[PDB]
C-alpha cells in the first residue's frame, strides 16, 4: 500500500481552504452541540451533565456532554466484547478501508469542520488546527493502514512438507483509550490504531476536546466502522480508570497524559492482576521538560524563531514544547535582545476572529491556575527574573501572555517541572563550560522526550548527539523541538516520558496485535521413534 | 550534513540442520566422548561479574535427574551485595556497548553460533543430557539447533532492523537510532530448555543492553557452558553477568534498583505476576518504565476430528505428551477424541505405550525419555497420579508407576477422564501425564467450545482432521486458545524462524521469540531530525 503525507495547506487569502474554514468557524459561532455517550449505535444520556467551554471565550459552551457511570461503562464493555470476534476475523485490508475512507473524508469534505471544532473547542489557531486535526490525524490513519497491511506480508519460513503462516490477531478483550486535550489527532490514533488491528475500544476522550473528538468519532462511523468497535464514553477520570481496571476483560490501556495518572493505572492493573484473563498491555506517552541547547556557532535567527515557536505555539501546551533554553554568554546579548523584541510583537487573542493571532488562551480554568502559580513562583524565586510577559487575565478567556524568564540556577524547580503553558526559562552558561552544561542538559530533569541542539560546528553536533542520546527520544539538530510528522519523526521518549512505543512509526501497531502462528503439515506423520534409537 | 549515516547491511542465515547421530557417525562418536567426559565429574561453577569468578557461602548442587547421586555441578547463589555490585558494573559498561555498531554486537552471536554448531556441539548436548535429563534428540533440537537459530536469526533481524528508516523531506534528514534500553535487564531462565537461557540473556545484549542473568539451578551446567562460549566469542566483560541466585532474593534486588529497565522471564505464572507486582510497587523509584516480558505455562490440547489420520494422531500425541517427560510449556496434556475413533486410537495408544523405553539417556540411546527434573517435580507428579486413582471421574489406562530410588523416574501415564472439567484437564502438571476425554461425534462443535474455555491458558494446540471445512471452522473457533496452532502435527517443537513461539491468556505476554519482532521489546528508538537550512520567521504567511 502506497501512502504519502497529507499536504499542509497555506490558507492564503481567497484560497479555497481559507474560505471553507471561515464558513466552518461561522457554523460554530453561538452553537452548543449535545454530545451523548455512544454504545453501539445507542445515544445514551446520564444525569452527570458536563460542558466544554471555548478557551478564549468561556461564556461559549461549545458542547454539552455527560459522564458515563460505572454501569454504563460496564454495558459498553459487554457490547464491545460481543462484537470483537467478527471484527477481528475481518481481513486486515477490510478494516484498513474504514480508516482510509475516514482519511479521505478528513482531507476533503470534513477538513474545515474538524479544523474549526479544534480551533473553537481547544483554542488552536488556524495552522495549529491544520497540522493536528487534518494532517496528523489523516497521516495516522493512512500510515497505520499501510503499516498494518504490510505487516500481513511479514510471514515465516515454510519448509516442506509444512506451511507456516502468522495471523496478526487483535488482543483478546477490550482496550481502554484515554486521550489528552492538546491534539485532536492523538485521540483518533489512541482509539483508532487498536481498532485497526482488530481490537474493540472504550474511548474516553478529553473533556476539553469533546467537540472535535466526537467529530472524529462520527467520521469513523460514517466511513464504515461497525457498531460496538469503538464506544464513545466520556467519563470522570478516576471512575473510568477504576472501572476498566476492574474488568477481567481488560487487555490494554492506550494512554496519553500525566505521569502520575499513568503510574496510578499501572498500579491498579498490577493490584488486579489475578482477575484478568490475560496480561494487559499498557502504553503511555507522558510529558517532557524539553530543551533547546545553543552552541556559540548557532545561527541566531534560527534559534530565535525556532525557540519562540517551540515555547509558545498553542500556548506551550505540547508534550514536546521547549521550556528550557541554554545559551552561551557570548550569544546572550543577541538572543536576549531579539527574544524580547519579537516577544512584544506576539499577538494573543481570539483565533477565530483574528487570524493574526500567534496563540490563544490556555485550555481551561485549572490550567490557567496552575500556570499562574508558576508565574507567581517566578516572581518569588531569588534565582528567577521575568524578562518579559507574565501577565494573565481570565475575565473573558483563559489568557496567559507568553513569558520569558531567566534562571541563574540551572537546577531550579522551573527548570525541572513540566508547566504546559507559555513559559520559557533561559539559563546562560559560560562559553568555556559548554561540556559541563551539556551534562546538565542530560542530568537535570526526570524526562526524556524532545530536545534540540543549535550549532554549525560538525564536531560539536557529533559530540552533543552522543552525549544527549537518552535525553531525548525525538532529537533535533538546527530545528525546533516540536512538530513531529508521521512517518518522518515517529514520536516518543523514555525516562519518565513514557513507554516509547513510537506512534507515527512502523512498529507502533505491534503493541495492539498478539500474533498466532499456524503450522499445517501436509503429509502423515511417521513413527514416534527416531532412527538413532535403533 | 553534519550527521552521516552508514548503508545498512543484510545477512543470509538458515536454520541449523538437525544431525542424525547414526551409528559410526562423527557426531555420535563425539557425543559419546562428551558424555564420558562428564561421567563422575562435578564442575564448580562460580558467579561471574565482569571477568571475576566469585564464590559466596550459599553453596548449591545440581543433580543428574536420572542418577541423583551424581552432583553434576556445585555452584553458589549471589548475595544481594554481589547482585548490586553486578548491576553497578554492568551499568558502567553499558554506554560503550550500546554505542557499538549493531553489526559488531551481532558478530559475537554469529561467532558463538558457529562454535555451538561445530567444536562445542557435543559439549552442550552432553551437558544438557546429563544435567537436565534430555535424550540425544531432545538435546540436539535444544542446546544446538534452537540456541544456534536464536543467535543467527536474531542477529539477522537486528542488523536488518537498522534498515527500517523514516521518510526524509527537504530541508531535513531523519534517522532512527535503535538505542538499547537505559538501565539493566534481568534475565530469568527455566530448566527445560538450554536455548531459552541463551535467548533471554542474549537477545537483550544483542540490542545494546546489559544483563544480569539468573540461570535455572537445574540447568546450571549447560547454562554456564553457553555463558563461557559467549565470552569466548568476544562478549566484553560486564555485558552479561552470570549470577545464579535464590529466586525471591534475585527478584527483590533487581526490582529495588532505580536502574531496572526490563525483566525477560520464562517460568511459572505466579512468579511472573509477583515480579510484575514488585515493579508496580517500586514504580516511583525507577528512572524509566521497566519492560516485562514473560512466557509461562500451558495446558495444551490435541483435538481429533472423526476424519483424522489415526496413525498421525497416535505418533504425534505420544511425542507431544511424553518427549522430555512432558516437561514442555507446549506439551499436549489433554487429548479430545471422537467416540467413533476411540476404539482404534485407544488400542494403538496402549500398544505403542508398552514399547516406550524409560531409562538412562547417556547409557542407553534406545531411551525415549528419562527421569523428570528434580525431587519437587517428582513429588508433584506423584500427587497427580494419586489423584487419578482417587478421583471417580478418572481412570488410569496405562502407566501410573514411579520410582525415585535412583533417578526421578516416572512412567508415561495415560488417563481417561469422564469429566471434561476435571481439575486434571485444567492444571499444568509438567510431567508425562496425558488425559483423554472422549466426546460424541455429533457434539464436536460444543466440544470445540470446551477446548477453548476449559483452561486459563492459550499456548499451543493441534487439530487432527482431513476435512477442509472442519479445519477452517476449528481454526476460526480456536483462534485464541493457542498462540502456536498446529494442523495435523504435534503441539511441540516450534522452530526458530518457522514457528515463532508464544501465546496469550495466562501463558504470558506473547512477544514471539523466534520471530522478527521479538528484538523490538529490547530497543527504545530515538529519532534524529537534522535540518539543513536556516529557519524562517516565527510568523506564518496566513497571519499577514
A175: three-class secondary structure by DSSP: strand
Say what angle helices B102-117 and B194-206 make with each other, to 10 degrees: 160
Selected residues 224-283 of chain A with any CB under 8 Å from a CB in chain B: 263, 266-267, 269-271, 273-274, 277-279, 281
Q: Which of A356, A354, A343 is nearest to A422 (CA)?
A: A343
Look up residue A190 and give its three cell numbers. 489512541
Ordered alpha helix ranges (H), B326-374: 342-353
Cross-strand pairs, A453:
A293, A477
B164 contacts in A (CB within 8 Å)? 506
Question: What is the C-alpha to C-alpha distance for residues B98 and B401, in angstroms, rounded to an integer?
Answer: 53
Look up residue A271 and give its three cell numbers. 493490584
Ordered alpha helix ranges (H), B40-172: 80-99, 102-117, 121-132, 136-139, 147-161
Structure letter (DSSP) for residue A525: -
Task: Determine how β-strand B504-505 pairs with β-strand B457-458.
Answer: antiparallel
Lookup result for grid cell 505405550: B353
Long-range CB contact pairs, A114-117, < 8 A, 24+: A114/A184, A114/A212, A114/A215, A114/A216, A114/A219, A115/A21, A115/A24, A116/A21, A116/A24, A116/A25, A116/A27, A116/A28, A116/A352, A117/A28, A117/A62, A117/A184, A117/A211, A117/A212, A117/A215
Q: Which residue of A has its CA nearest to B167?
A: A488
A177: three-class secondary structure by DSSP: strand
Whether chain A has a CB inside 8 Å of the CB on B18: the answer is no
Q: What is the per-residue DSSP string for A359-403?
A: B---S-HHHHHHHHHHHHHHHH-TTEEEEE---EE-SSS-EE--E
Lookup result for grid cell 476435571: B422
Pairwise CB contact (< 8 Å): A494 & B288 = yes
Long-range CB contact pairs, B101-107, < 8 A, 24+: B101/B6, B102/B158, B102/B159, B102/B161, B102/B162, B102/B178, B102/B208, B103/B9, B103/B159, B105/B158, B105/B205, B105/B206, B105/B207, B105/B208, B106/B11, B106/B155, B106/B158, B106/B159, B106/B206, B107/B234
Question: What is the C-alpha to C-alpha distance for residues A167 and A372, in angstroms, rounded to an integer?
Answer: 52
- In terms of C-beta density within 10 A (0-12 exposed, 13-18 middle, 19 or more buried), how is residue A198 classed? buried
C-alpha dist (Å) from residue B511 to A33, A144, A230, A295, A473 = 44, 20, 26, 43, 23
Pairwise CB contact (< 8 Å): A126 & B277 = no
Cβ-based neighbours of B494, under 8 Å, separated by 6 or more: A517, B330, B484, B500, B501, B514
Q: From the annotation, which residues of A make up the binding site for substrate? A: 484
C-alpha dist (Å) from residue B186 to A174, B227, B259 = 30, 15, 11
Whether chain A has a CB inside 8 Å of the CB on B528: the answer is yes
Whether chain A has a CB inside 8 Å of the CB on B188: the answer is no
Lookup result for grid cell 495547506: A9
Cβ-based neighbours of B331, under 8 Å, separated by 6 or more: B298, B300, B320, B321, B323, B430, B491, B492
Question: What is the C-alpha to C-alpha distance for residues B40 and A495, in angstroms, rounded to an integer?
Answer: 51
Lookup result for grid cell 480508570: A241
Whether chain A has a CB inside 8 Å of the CB on B9: the answer is no
The DSSP H or E segment spanning B541 is none
Question: What is the C-alpha to C-alpha distance for residues B204 and B111, in angstroms, rounded to an integer?
Answer: 17
Q: Name which of B166, B208, B319, B466 to mutate to probe chain A: the one with the most chain A Cβ atoms within 10 A of its Cβ.
A: B166
Lookup result for grid cell 544431525: B19
Question: What is the C-alpha to C-alpha distance for residues A489 and A187, in angstroms, rounded to an integer?
Answer: 19
CB distance B220 to B297 below 8 Å: no
Q: Is A319 a catalytic residue?
A: yes
Q: How many CB atoms lie within 10 A of CB A391?
A: 13
Backbone dihedral angles phi then psi of residue A38, each to the nearest 5 degrees = -125, 115
Pairwise CB contact (< 8 Å): A461 & B486 = no
**For B190, how many CA atoms within 13 A lie in the half-sphere containing its CB?**
21
CB distance B171 to B533 below 8 Å: yes
Distance of CA A509 to the CA centre of its chain: 16
Q: Across A146-263, where does the E strand assignment appear?
A: 162-167, 174-178, 200-204, 230-232, 250-256
Distance of CA A514 to the CA centre of its chain: 24
CB distance A151 to A511 below 8 Å: no
Q: Tell me the domains of chain B and their CATH numbers.
A: 1-296+496-544 (3.40.605.10), 297-495 (3.40.309.10)
Q: Is B261 a catalytic residue?
A: no
Look up residue B467 and give its three cell numbers. 476435512
Q: Which of B460, B467, B464, B458 is nearest to B494 (CA)?
A: B460
Resolution, angstroms, 1 dp: 1.7
Tell me the Ramachandran region of residue B234: left when phi exceeds 0, alpha when psi lies from -120 to 50, beta otherwise: left
Pairwise CB contact (< 8 Å): A517 & B499 = yes
Distance of CA B50 to the CA centre of its chain: 26
Question: What is the C-alpha to C-alpha distance for residues B490 and B332, in angstroms, rounded to an integer?
Answer: 8
Question: What is the C-alpha to C-alpha distance for residues B268 and B193, in angstroms, rounded to an integer?
Answer: 14
Question: What is the C-alpha to C-alpha distance for residues B274 and B199, in angstroms, rounded to an integer?
Answer: 22
Ordered alpha helix ranges (H), B140-268: 147-161, 194-206, 220-232, 247-255
Is the CA virtual torsion A9, A11, A14, A18 positive or negative? positive
Structure letter (DSSP) for residue B76: E
Q: What is the 3-state secondary structure (H, E, C) of A414-460?
A: HHCCCCCCCEEEEEEECHHHHHHHHHHHHHCCCEECEEEEECCCHHH
Question: What is the C-alpha to C-alpha distance for residues B489 and A479, in angstroms, rounded to an integer?
Answer: 57
- Buried b or exposed e, range B29-49, using 16+ CB within 10 angstroms: ebbbebbeebeeeebebbbbb
Q: Which of A482, A487, A494 is nearest to A508 (CA)?
A: A487
Pairwise CB contact (< 8 Å): A519 & B15 = no
Residue among A10, A489, A502 minimizing CB distance to B542:
A10
Residue among B283, B485, B537 minimizing CB distance to A267:
B283
Instruction: Rounding to the nearest 10 degrees, give the CA dihedral for residues B92, B94, B96, B99.
Output: -160
CB distance B490 to B319 below 8 Å: yes
Look up residue A495 and give its three cell numbers. 525516562
User: What is the nearest CA distance from A330 to chain B, expressed in angstroms?
Assistant: 20
Cross-strand pairs, A423:
A403
CB distance B21 to B361 below 8 Å: no
CB distance B261 to B232 below 8 Å: no
Cross-strand pairs, B526:
B177
Pairwise CB contact (< 8 Å): B2 & A458 = yes
- Buried b or exposed e, range A132-167, using 16+ CB within 10 angstroms: bbbbbbbbbbbbbbbbbbebeeeebeeeeebebebb
Specify the length of chain A in residues.
534
Question: What is the C-alpha to C-alpha distance for residues B428 and B435, in angstroms, rounded to an integer?
Answer: 11
Q: Name which of B26, B269, B518, B529 to mutate to probe chain A: the one with the most chain A Cβ atoms within 10 A of its Cβ.
A: B529
Q: How many CB atoms lie within 10 A of CB A349?
A: 17
Pairwise CB contact (< 8 Å): A477 & B22 = no
Lookup result for grid cell 492506550: A254
Question: What is the C-alpha to C-alpha distance for residues B316 and B493, in angstroms, rounded to an integer?
Answer: 11
Residue B393 annotated as binding? no
Say what angle helices B269-281 and A259-271 make with each other, to 10 degrees: 150
Is the CA virtual torsion A78, A83, A88, A89 positive or negative? positive
Residue among B167, B273, B526 minimizing CB distance to A488:
B167
Q: Which of B286, B81, B77 is nearest to B184 (CA)?
A: B286
C-alpha dist (Å) from residue B126 to B24, B73, B123, B359, B492 = 18, 14, 5, 16, 22
Look up residue B532 and give its three cell numbers. 539543513
CB distance B234 to B108 below 8 Å: yes
What was the structure determination method?
X-ray
Q: Which of B265, B288, B301, B269 is nearest to B485 (CA)?
A: B301
CB distance B278 to B251 below 8 Å: yes
Structure letter (DSSP) for residue A313: G
Question: What is the C-alpha to C-alpha distance for residues B460 and B483, in angstroms, rounded to an integer?
Answer: 6
B530 contacts in A (CB within 8 Å)? 476-479
Between the two ends of chain B, the Cα-to-Cα distance in Å is 33
Q: What is the per-residue DSSP string for B479-534?
A: TTT-SEEEESS-S----TTTS----EETTB----TTSTTGGGGGB--EEEEEE-S-
Does the bond joining A161 to the residue before it have cis omega, within 30 degrees of 0? Answer: yes
Pairwise CB contact (< 8 Å): A490 & B176 = yes
Query: What does the radius of gyration of chain B's CA atoms come to, in whole angstroms?
Result: 25
Question: What is the C-alpha to C-alpha distance for residues A231 and A247, in angstroms, rounded to an integer?
Answer: 16
Pairwise CB contact (< 8 Å): B529 & A462 = no
Ordered alpha helix ranges (H), B323-467: 342-353, 375-390, 444-453
Does the bond joining B199 to the residue before it have cis omega, within 30 degrees of 0? Answer: no
Residue B271 annotated as binding? yes
Q: What is the per-residue DSSP string for B1-63?
A: --S--PPPP-----PPPPP---TT-HHHHHHHHHHHHHTT--EEE-EEETTEEE--S-EEEEE
Backbone dihedral angles phi then psi of residue B362, each to the nearest 5 degrees = -80, -40
User: What is the nearest CA distance from A338 to chain B, expressed in angstroms?
Assistant: 12
CB distance A368 to A394 below 8 Å: yes
Question: What is the C-alpha to C-alpha distance for residues A102 and B464, in angstroms, rounded to an integer?
Answer: 43
Question: What is the C-alpha to C-alpha distance for residues A264 and A165, in angstroms, rounded to an integer?
Answer: 39
CB distance B502 to B510 below 8 Å: yes
Cβ-based neighbours of A532, under 8 Å, separated by 6 or more: B20, B21, B22, B28, B136, B137, B365
Q: Name which of B284, B368, B509, B535 to mutate to probe chain A: the one with the most chain A Cβ atoms within 10 A of its Cβ.
A: B535
Q: Which residue of A has its CA nearest to B508?
A: A279
Amino acid at each position: 500500500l502506497k501512502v504519502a503525507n497529507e499536504p499542509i495547506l497555506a490558507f492564503s487569502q481567497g484560497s479555497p481552504e481559507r474560505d471553507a474554514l471561515q464558513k466552518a468557524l461561522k457554523d460554530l459561532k453561538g452553537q452548543t452541540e449535545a454530545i451523548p455517550c455512544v454504545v453501539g449505535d445507542e445515544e445514551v444520556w446520564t444525569s452527570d451533565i458536563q460542558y466544554q467551554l471555548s478557551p478564549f471565550n468561556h461564556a461559549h459552551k461549545v458542547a454539552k456532554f455527560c459522564y458515563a457511570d460505572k454501569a454504563l461503562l460496564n454495558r459498553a464493555i459487554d457490547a464491545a466484547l460481543a462484537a470483537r470476534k467478527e471484527w477481528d476475523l475481518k481481513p486486515m485490508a477490510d478494516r484498513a478501508q474504514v480508516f482510509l475512507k475516514a482519511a479521505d473524508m478528513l482531507s476533503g469534505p470534513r477538513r474545515a469542520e474538524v479544523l474549526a471544532k479544534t480551533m473553537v473547542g481547544q483554542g488552536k489557531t488556524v495552522i495549529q488546527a491544520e497540522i493536528d486535526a487534518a494532517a496528523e490525524l489523516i497521516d495516522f490513519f493512512r500510515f497505520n493502514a499501510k503499516f498494518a497491511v504490510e505487516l500481513e506480508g511479514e510471514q515465516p519460513i515454510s519448509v516442506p512438507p509444512s506451511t507456516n503462516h502468522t495471523v496478526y490477531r487483535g488482543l483478546e478483550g477490550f482496550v481502554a483509550a484515554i486521550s489528552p486535550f492538546n491534539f485532536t489527532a492523538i485521540g483518533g490514533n489512541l482509539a483508532g490504531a487498536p481498532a485497526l488491528m482488530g481490537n474493540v475500544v472504550l474511548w474516553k476522550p478529553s473533556d476539553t476536546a469533546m467537540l472535535a473528538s466526537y467529530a472524529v468519532y462520527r467520521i469513523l462511523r460514517e466511513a464504515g466502522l461497525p457498531p460496538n468497535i469503538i464506544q464513545f464514553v466520556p467519563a470522570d477520570g478516576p471512575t473510568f480508570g477504576d472501572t476498566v481496571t476492574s474488568s477481567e476483560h481488560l487487555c490494554g490501556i492506550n494512554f496519553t497524559g500525566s505521569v502520575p495518572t499513568f503510574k496510578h493505572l499501572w498500579r491498579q492493573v498490577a493490584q488486579n492482576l489475578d482477575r484478568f484473563r490475560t496480561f494487559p498491555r499498557l502504553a503511555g506517552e507522558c510529558g517532557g521538560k524539553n530543551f533547546h541547547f545553543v552552541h556559540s556557532s548557532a545561527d541566531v535567527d534560527s534559534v530565535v524563531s525556532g525557540t519562540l515557536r517551540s515555547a509558545f505555539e498553542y500556548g506551550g501546551q505540547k508534550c514536546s514544547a521547549c521550556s528550557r533554553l541554554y545559551v552561551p554568554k557570548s550569544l546572550w546579548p543577541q538572543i536576549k535582545g531579539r527574544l524580547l523584541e519579537e516577544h512584544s510583537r506576539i499577538k494573543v487573542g481570539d483565533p477565530a476572529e483574528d487570524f493574526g493571532t500567534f496563540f490563544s488562551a490556555v485550555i481551561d480554568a485549572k490550567a490557567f491556575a496552575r500556570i499562574k502559580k508558576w508565574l507567581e513562583h517566578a516572581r518569588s524565586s531569588p534565582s528567577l527574573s521575568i524578562l518579559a510577559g507574565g501577565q494573565c487575565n481570565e475575565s473573558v478567556g483563559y489568557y496567559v501572555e507568553p513569558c520569558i524568564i531567566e534562571s541563574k540556577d540551572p537546577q531550579e524547580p522551573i527548570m525541572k517541572e513540566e508547566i504546559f503553558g507559555p513559559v520559557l526559562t533561559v539559563y546562560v552558561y559560560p562559553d568555556d563550560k559548554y561540556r559541563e552544561t551539556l551534562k546538565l542538559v542530560d542530568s537535570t530533569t526526570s524526562y526524556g522526550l524532545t530536545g534540540a541542539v543549535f550549532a554549525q560546528d560538525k564536531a560539536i553536533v557529533q559530540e552533543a548527539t552522543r552525549m544527549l542520546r537518552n535525553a531525548a527520544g525525538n532529537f533535533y539538530i538546527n530545528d525546533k523541538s516540536t512538530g513531529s510528522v508521521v512517518g518522518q519523526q515517529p514520536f516518543g521518549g523514555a525516562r519518565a516520558s513514557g513507554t516509547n512505543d513510537k506512534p507515527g512509526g512502523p512498529h507502533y501497531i505491534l503493541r495492539w496485535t498478539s500474533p498466532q502462528v499456524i503450522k499445517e503439515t501436509h503429509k502423515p506423520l511417521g513413527d514416534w521413534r527416531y532412527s538413532y534409537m535403533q
